[PDB]
């Protein structure tokens, strides 16, 4: 109920809340870090909104920068689940 009252705002005030889809730890596939699931669901909202732009110059600038941060995270994701240092 509070999700539908925050993702369906009338754009009344500048401060805004964007709600990710509900995450269920039980139904989530095991041996998968929560941080990975959150980023995957966060990607869909940003990627779909990136597709929704109208200014071609703005879309190309953000896509280059946003895709750069994801490539930085995956390099460090090895450090999250390891059994030894190297």
């Amino acid at each position: 109920s509070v999700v539908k009252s925050l993702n369906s705002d009338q754009d009344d005030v500048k401060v805004n809340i964007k709600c990710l889809p509900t995450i269920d730890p039980t139904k989530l596939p095991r041996h998968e870090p929560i941080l990975v699931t959150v980023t995957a669901r966060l990607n869909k909202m940003v990627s779909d909104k990136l597709k929704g732009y109208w200014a071609s110059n703005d879309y190309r600038k953000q896509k280059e920068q946003w895709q750069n941060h994801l490539a930085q995270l995956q390099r460090g994701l090895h450090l999250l689940t390891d059994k030894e240092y190297k």
Partner: protein
């Protein structure tokens, strides 16, 4: 981490609202397609008893909880509660 990039993938198939793999939704649309080919409202999955084992039941119980959730499936289990409760 080699499969992290695969989860963060945009698809033209149904434009999956939930990111990542999420095998629950992948199997869900498979049943919808099978109903169109078979021309039926729903498909029933019927399981037999586990009355001689205590490991066949656990995989049956877990699969029903996670995957077989759509309205196109009706499941008819079989057994006695004493084994399942234990």
């Amino acid at each position: 981490p080699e499969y992290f990039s695969d989860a963060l993938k945009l698809d033209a198939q149904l434009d999956y609202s939930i990111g990542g793999q999420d095998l629950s939704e992948i199997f869900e649309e498979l049943v919808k397609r099978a109903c169109e080919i078979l021309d039926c409202k729903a498909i029933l999955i019927t399981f037999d008893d586990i009355d001689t084992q205590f490991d066949a039941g656990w995989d049956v119980l877990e699969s029903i909880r996670k995957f077989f959730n759509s309205r196109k499936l009706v499941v008819v289990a079989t057994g006695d509660l004493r084994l399942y409760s234990q």
